[PDB]
Coordinates of C-alpha atoms in Angstrom, one line a residue:
Chain N
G1 CA -20.9 2.0 9.7
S2 CA -18.7 -0.5 11.4
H3 CA -15.1 0.1 12.5
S4 CA -12.1 -1.7 13.9
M5 CA -8.8 -1.2 15.6
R6 CA -6.0 -3.7 15.0
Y7 CA -2.4 -4.1 16.1
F8 CA 0.1 -6.2 14.1
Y9 CA 3.2 -7.4 15.8
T10 CA 6.2 -9.1 14.0
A11 CA 9.1 -10.5 16.0
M12 CA 12.0 -12.0 13.9
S13 CA 15.0 -13.8 15.2
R14 CA 18.3 -13.5 13.2
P15 CA 21.1 -15.6 14.9
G16 CA 24.5 -14.0 14.3
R17 CA 22.9 -10.6 13.6
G18 CA 21.9 -9.5 17.0
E19 CA 18.7 -9.9 19.1
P20 CA 15.3 -10.4 17.4
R21 CA 13.7 -7.4 15.7
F22 CA 10.3 -6.3 16.9
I23 CA 8.0 -4.2 14.7
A24 CA 4.5 -3.1 15.7
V25 CA 1.9 -1.2 13.7
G26 CA -1.5 0.0 14.7
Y27 CA -4.5 0.6 12.3
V28 CA -8.0 2.0 12.6
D29 CA -9.9 0.4 9.7
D30 CA -7.5 0.7 6.7
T31 CA -5.6 3.7 8.2
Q32 CA -2.3 3.1 9.9
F33 CA -1.8 5.5 12.9
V34 CA 1.3 4.3 14.9
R35 CA 4.5 2.4 14.3
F36 CA 7.4 1.0 16.4
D37 CA 10.6 -0.6 15.2
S38 CA 13.3 -1.9 17.6
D39 CA 15.9 -1.3 14.9
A40 CA 15.2 2.4 14.8
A41 CA 18.1 4.6 16.0
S42 CA 16.0 5.6 19.0
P43 CA 13.0 3.2 19.1
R44 CA 9.7 5.0 20.1
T45 CA 6.1 4.6 19.2
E46 CA 5.6 7.2 16.4
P47 CA 2.5 8.8 14.8
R48 CA 1.5 7.8 11.3
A49 CA -1.8 9.7 11.0
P50 CA -2.5 13.3 11.6
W51 CA -5.3 12.8 14.2
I52 CA -3.1 10.9 16.6
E53 CA -0.5 13.7 16.8
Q54 CA -2.6 15.6 19.4
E55 CA -2.1 12.8 22.0
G56 CA 0.2 14.1 24.7
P57 CA 3.6 12.9 26.0
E58 CA 1.9 10.5 28.5
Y59 CA 0.4 8.7 25.6
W60 CA 3.6 8.4 23.6
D61 CA 5.8 7.5 26.6
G62 CA 3.2 4.9 27.7
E63 CA 3.0 3.3 24.3
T64 CA 6.8 3.3 23.9
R65 CA 7.3 1.7 27.3
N66 CA 4.7 -0.9 26.3
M67 CA 6.3 -1.7 23.0
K68 CA 9.8 -2.0 24.5
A69 CA 8.5 -4.4 27.1
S70 CA 6.6 -6.3 24.4
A71 CA 9.8 -6.6 22.3
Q72 CA 11.6 -8.1 25.3
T73 CA 8.8 -10.6 25.9
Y74 CA 8.8 -11.6 22.3
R75 CA 12.5 -12.3 22.5
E76 CA 11.8 -14.7 25.3
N77 CA 8.9 -16.2 23.3
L78 CA 11.2 -16.9 20.4
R79 CA 13.5 -18.8 22.7
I80 CA 10.6 -20.7 24.2
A81 CA 9.3 -21.6 20.7
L82 CA 12.6 -23.3 19.9
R83 CA 12.1 -25.6 22.9
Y84 CA 8.4 -26.2 21.9
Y85 CA 9.5 -27.3 18.4
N86 CA 12.8 -29.0 19.1
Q87 CA 14.6 -26.4 16.9
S88 CA 18.1 -25.2 16.9
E89 CA 19.5 -21.8 17.9
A90 CA 20.9 -21.3 14.3
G91 CA 17.7 -20.7 12.4
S92 CA 15.7 -17.5 11.9
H93 CA 12.1 -17.7 13.1
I94 CA 9.1 -15.3 13.3
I95 CA 6.2 -14.8 15.7
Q96 CA 3.3 -12.7 14.6
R97 CA 0.3 -11.4 16.5
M98 CA -2.8 -9.5 15.3
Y99 CA -5.4 -8.3 17.8
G100 CA -8.0 -5.8 18.4
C101 CA -11.7 -4.9 18.5
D102 CA -14.6 -4.4 16.0
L103 CA -17.5 -2.1 16.7
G104 CA -20.8 -2.4 14.9
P105 CA -22.7 0.5 13.2
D106 CA -24.3 1.3 16.6
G107 CA -20.8 1.7 18.1
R108 CA -21.0 -1.3 20.4
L109 CA -18.3 -4.0 20.6
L110 CA -19.2 -6.5 17.8
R111 CA -16.3 -8.8 18.6
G112 CA -12.7 -9.1 19.7
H113 CA -9.7 -10.8 18.2
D114 CA -6.3 -12.0 19.3
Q115 CA -4.4 -14.5 17.1
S116 CA -0.7 -15.5 17.0
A117 CA 1.4 -17.4 14.5
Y118 CA 4.8 -19.1 14.4
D119 CA 6.7 -19.2 11.1
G120 CA 3.6 -18.0 9.3
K121 CA 1.3 -20.8 10.5
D122 CA -1.6 -20.4 13.0
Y123 CA -0.3 -21.0 16.5
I124 CA -3.0 -20.0 19.0
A125 CA -6.2 -17.9 18.8
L126 CA -8.6 -16.4 21.4
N127 CA -12.1 -17.8 20.7
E128 CA -14.9 -15.4 20.0
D129 CA -16.2 -15.9 23.6
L130 CA -13.0 -14.0 24.8
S131 CA -12.7 -16.8 27.4
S132 CA -11.2 -19.9 25.7
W133 CA -8.4 -20.7 23.2
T134 CA -8.0 -22.7 20.0
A135 CA -4.5 -24.2 19.8
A136 CA -3.2 -25.2 16.4
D137 CA -0.8 -28.0 17.5
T138 CA 0.7 -29.7 20.5
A139 CA 3.1 -26.9 21.2
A140 CA 0.3 -24.3 21.3
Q141 CA -1.5 -26.7 23.7
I142 CA 1.3 -26.2 26.1
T143 CA 0.8 -22.4 25.8
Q144 CA -3.0 -22.9 26.2
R145 CA -2.4 -24.9 29.5
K146 CA -0.2 -22.1 30.8
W147 CA -2.7 -19.4 29.7
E148 CA -5.6 -21.2 31.3
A149 CA -3.8 -21.7 34.6
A150 CA -2.9 -17.9 34.6
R151 CA -6.3 -16.7 33.4
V152 CA -4.8 -14.8 30.5
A153 CA -8.1 -14.8 28.6
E154 CA -9.7 -12.7 31.4
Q155 CA -7.1 -10.0 31.0
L156 CA -7.5 -10.0 27.2
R157 CA -11.3 -9.8 27.5
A158 CA -11.0 -6.8 29.9
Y159 CA -8.7 -5.1 27.3
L160 CA -10.8 -5.9 24.3
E161 CA -14.2 -4.9 25.9
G162 CA -12.7 -1.9 27.7
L163 CA -9.6 0.0 26.7
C164 CA -9.7 -1.2 23.1
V165 CA -13.2 0.0 22.5
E166 CA -12.8 3.2 24.5
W167 CA -9.7 4.3 22.6
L168 CA -11.0 3.2 19.2
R169 CA -14.0 5.5 19.9
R170 CA -11.7 8.3 20.8
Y171 CA -9.7 7.9 17.6
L172 CA -12.8 7.7 15.5
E173 CA -14.0 11.0 17.0
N174 CA -10.6 12.8 16.7
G175 CA -10.1 11.5 13.1
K176 CA -13.8 11.8 12.1
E177 CA -13.1 13.9 8.9
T178 CA -11.2 10.9 7.4
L179 CA -11.9 7.8 9.4
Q180 CA -15.7 8.4 9.1
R181 CA -15.6 9.3 5.5
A182 CA -16.0 6.8 2.7
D183 CA -14.6 7.8 -0.7
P184 CA -16.4 6.0 -3.5
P185 CA -14.4 4.5 -6.4
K186 CA -13.8 6.4 -9.6
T187 CA -14.7 3.7 -12.2
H188 CA -14.2 3.1 -15.9
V189 CA -13.8 0.2 -18.4
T190 CA -10.9 0.0 -20.8
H191 CA -10.7 -2.2 -23.9
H192 CA -7.6 -3.6 -25.4
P193 CA -7.5 -6.1 -28.3
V194 CA -5.5 -9.3 -27.7
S195 CA -6.0 -10.4 -31.4
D196 CA -8.5 -9.9 -34.2
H197 CA -11.1 -12.0 -32.4
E198 CA -10.6 -11.4 -28.7
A199 CA -10.3 -8.3 -26.5
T200 CA -9.6 -7.6 -22.8
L201 CA -12.2 -5.6 -20.9
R202 CA -10.7 -4.2 -17.7
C203 CA -12.9 -2.7 -15.1
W204 CA -11.0 -0.2 -12.9
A205 CA -11.8 1.2 -9.5
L206 CA -9.5 4.0 -8.3
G207 CA -9.3 6.4 -5.3
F208 CA -11.6 4.5 -2.9
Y209 CA -11.6 4.2 0.9
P210 CA -12.0 1.9 2.7
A211 CA -10.3 -1.0 0.9
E212 CA -13.2 -3.4 0.9
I213 CA -14.8 -3.5 -2.6
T214 CA -16.4 -6.0 -4.9
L215 CA -15.7 -5.9 -8.6
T216 CA -17.4 -8.5 -10.8
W217 CA -17.9 -9.1 -14.5
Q218 CA -21.2 -10.5 -15.9
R219 CA -21.8 -12.0 -19.3
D220 CA -25.4 -11.9 -20.3
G221 CA -26.2 -11.2 -16.6
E222 CA -24.2 -14.2 -15.3
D223 CA -21.2 -13.8 -13.0
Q224 CA -17.9 -14.7 -14.7
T225 CA -16.2 -15.7 -11.5
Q226 CA -14.0 -18.5 -12.9
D227 CA -13.1 -16.5 -16.1
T228 CA -12.2 -13.2 -14.4
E229 CA -8.6 -12.0 -13.5
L230 CA -8.9 -10.0 -10.3
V231 CA -5.8 -8.2 -9.0
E232 CA -5.2 -7.8 -5.2
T233 CA -6.5 -4.5 -3.9
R234 CA -3.4 -2.2 -3.7
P235 CA -2.6 1.1 -1.9
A236 CA -2.2 4.3 -3.9
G237 CA -0.1 6.0 -1.2
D238 CA -2.6 8.8 -0.5
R239 CA -4.8 6.6 1.8
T240 CA -6.9 5.3 -1.1
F241 CA -6.9 2.0 -2.9
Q242 CA -7.1 0.7 -6.4
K243 CA -8.3 -2.5 -8.0
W244 CA -9.2 -3.9 -11.4
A245 CA -11.0 -7.0 -12.8
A246 CA -10.4 -8.2 -16.4
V247 CA -12.1 -10.6 -18.8
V248 CA -11.0 -11.7 -22.2
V249 CA -14.1 -11.6 -24.5
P250 CA -14.9 -12.5 -28.1
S251 CA -14.6 -9.4 -30.3
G252 CA -18.1 -8.1 -31.2
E253 CA -19.5 -9.4 -27.9
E254 CA -18.2 -6.6 -25.7
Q255 CA -21.7 -5.2 -25.1
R256 CA -22.8 -8.5 -23.5
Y257 CA -20.5 -7.7 -20.6
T258 CA -21.2 -5.6 -17.6
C259 CA -19.0 -4.7 -14.6
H260 CA -20.6 -4.4 -11.2
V261 CA -19.1 -2.4 -8.4
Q262 CA -20.1 -2.5 -4.7
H263 CA -18.5 -0.1 -2.2
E264 CA -19.5 1.5 1.0
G265 CA -19.1 5.0 -0.5
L266 CA -21.7 4.3 -3.3
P267 CA -25.4 4.8 -2.6
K268 CA -26.2 1.9 -4.8
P269 CA -24.1 -0.7 -6.7
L270 CA -22.8 0.6 -10.0
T271 CA -23.1 -1.1 -13.4
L272 CA -20.7 -0.1 -16.1
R273 CA -19.9 -1.2 -19.6
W274 CA -17.2 -0.4 -22.2
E275 CA -18.1 2.9 -23.9
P276 CA -16.5 3.1 -27.3
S277 CA -15.7 6.6 -28.4
Chain V
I1 CA 7.1 -22.9 4.9
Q2 CA 8.0 -20.0 2.5
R3 CA 5.8 -17.8 0.3
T4 CA 7.1 -15.9 -2.7
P5 CA 6.1 -12.2 -3.3
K6 CA 3.4 -11.0 -5.6
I7 CA 4.5 -7.8 -7.3
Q8 CA 2.4 -4.9 -8.7
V9 CA 4.1 -1.8 -10.3
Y10 CA 1.8 1.2 -10.9
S11 CA 1.4 4.9 -10.3
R12 CA -0.6 6.8 -7.6
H13 CA -2.6 8.6 -10.3
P14 CA -3.2 7.7 -14.0
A15 CA 0.1 8.6 -15.7
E16 CA 0.2 11.8 -17.8
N17 CA 3.5 12.7 -19.4
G18 CA 5.2 15.7 -17.7
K19 CA 2.9 15.6 -14.6
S20 CA 4.4 14.7 -11.3
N21 CA 3.2 11.4 -9.8
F22 CA 4.4 8.6 -7.6
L23 CA 5.7 5.2 -8.8
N24 CA 4.6 2.4 -6.5
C25 CA 5.8 -1.2 -6.2
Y26 CA 3.5 -3.2 -3.9
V27 CA 5.0 -6.5 -2.7
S28 CA 2.6 -8.8 -0.9
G29 CA 1.9 -12.4 0.0
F30 CA 5.5 -13.2 1.0
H31 CA 7.0 -15.0 4.0
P32 CA 9.5 -14.6 5.7
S33 CA 9.6 -10.8 5.9
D34 CA 13.2 -10.0 4.7
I35 CA 12.9 -8.7 1.2
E36 CA 15.0 -6.4 -1.1
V37 CA 13.1 -4.0 -3.4
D38 CA 14.6 -1.5 -5.8
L39 CA 12.9 0.9 -8.1
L40 CA 14.6 1.3 -11.5
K41 CA 14.6 4.1 -14.1
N42 CA 16.0 2.9 -17.5
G43 CA 17.7 0.1 -15.7
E44 CA 19.4 2.1 -12.9
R45 CA 18.5 2.1 -9.2
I46 CA 16.6 5.2 -8.0
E47 CA 18.2 6.5 -4.8
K48 CA 15.3 8.2 -3.2
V49 CA 12.8 5.4 -2.4
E50 CA 10.7 5.1 0.7
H51 CA 8.6 2.3 2.0
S52 CA 5.7 1.6 4.3
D53 CA 6.0 0.0 7.7
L54 CA 5.9 -3.8 7.8
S55 CA 2.5 -5.3 8.2
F56 CA 0.7 -8.5 7.2
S57 CA -2.5 -10.0 6.0
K58 CA -4.9 -12.3 7.8
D59 CA -3.0 -15.3 6.3
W60 CA 0.2 -14.0 8.0
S61 CA 1.9 -13.0 4.7
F62 CA 3.6 -9.7 4.7
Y63 CA 3.1 -6.6 2.5
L64 CA 5.1 -3.5 1.8
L65 CA 4.6 -0.5 -0.5
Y66 CA 7.8 1.0 -2.0
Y67 CA 7.4 4.4 -3.7
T68 CA 9.1 7.3 -5.2
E69 CA 8.1 10.6 -6.7
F70 CA 8.5 10.8 -10.5
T71 CA 7.5 12.6 -13.6
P72 CA 6.7 10.0 -16.4
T73 CA 7.7 10.7 -20.0
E74 CA 7.0 9.0 -23.3
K75 CA 10.4 7.2 -23.5
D76 CA 11.5 6.7 -19.8
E77 CA 11.0 3.1 -18.6
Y78 CA 10.5 2.1 -15.0
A79 CA 10.6 -1.1 -13.1
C80 CA 10.6 -2.8 -9.7
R81 CA 13.4 -5.3 -8.9
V82 CA 12.6 -7.7 -6.0
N83 CA 14.8 -10.3 -4.3
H84 CA 13.6 -12.7 -1.6
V85 CA 14.8 -16.0 -0.2
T86 CA 12.2 -17.8 -2.4
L87 CA 13.8 -16.3 -5.6
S88 CA 16.9 -17.8 -7.1
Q89 CA 17.5 -14.5 -8.9
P90 CA 16.0 -11.0 -8.7
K91 CA 12.6 -10.7 -10.4
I92 CA 12.2 -7.5 -12.5
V93 CA 8.7 -6.3 -13.2
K94 CA 8.4 -3.5 -15.7
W95 CA 5.9 -0.6 -15.2
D96 CA 3.0 -0.9 -17.6
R97 CA 1.1 2.4 -17.4
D98 CA -2.2 0.4 -18.1
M99 CA -1.9 -2.2 -15.3
Chain R
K1 CA -3.9 2.1 22.6
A2 CA -2.0 -1.2 22.7
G3 CA -2.7 -4.2 24.9
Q4 CA -0.3 -6.5 26.7
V5 CA 2.1 -9.3 25.7
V6 CA 2.5 -12.5 27.9
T7 CA 5.0 -15.3 27.6
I8 CA 4.0 -18.4 25.6

């Protein structure tokens, strides 16, 4: 099906505790494959998935040089942001960036992304046209004016439509045994009384990849959206994910409830119920 | 401007007493990124704990997985202890082998 | 493969 590559950059100032830290991670879909941390003993871009390890020294040296230069540019950007927001040199601040490309099932570029944030709030985003910007506030409008004058969007577009897609396709091929394999959830319903007249039904999904999943409870065939406790999808640590959805139901009515599971690794959506032993 | 962590404590596989496993503490939804996470066994800090590389969600909030290898038993208790600038005191979340 | 970073 569809696939994406995304890089996530975090730059964090820390006055009195040295220069700002820069961390970068790269993902294909929900699989991390590279990392960089300026606080490492010897900062280098490092492999985090087995299928990237085959890349040669030119790859690793080039990515490391890029990340080091990026760290330096973000240190400058943190200083500039102080001027844009009338802020003092004593506070700690964070710039974040996420960017990359999505391919559709056919393998063509579906769309590109490049968004940045300051202190956890939208700052500036490249529009879907890969040609214009959306600035979140008057500071980001200064950046937008600079980037328009310097034709930065054209550079981003060339990367997103070119290198980003070409390298994502390479990674998908080199990692095809895992990146192009969906693992369907293992599912079951548990039952736990809360009292004599109510019980929790919890619908579990375990061991699935990729992370996108839909778990829903129905009562008499009607979705229980506002009555369902849904935990955030969470990583197991073996590449797969876990999730559960729970409802509190009147005792004796358990059989009126059905859990519905949608996942890319399933041929059809599943319906499950509590199965008393 | 600050967001407090969500915390889930769970195992990589369904727990079976005497079978090796991994204990996970997933912290997410927080901002800024500095955070202190310990895994506890019977109230004491586990020394050998690793964590994932810092990343974040589409709403800019950070997430991290802390994890350690362990063999659960009937009586041993485990927990995740988290401190963050948004917390006046560390938050301790006990491992429930059914959550 | 990573892209480039410019000044804000």
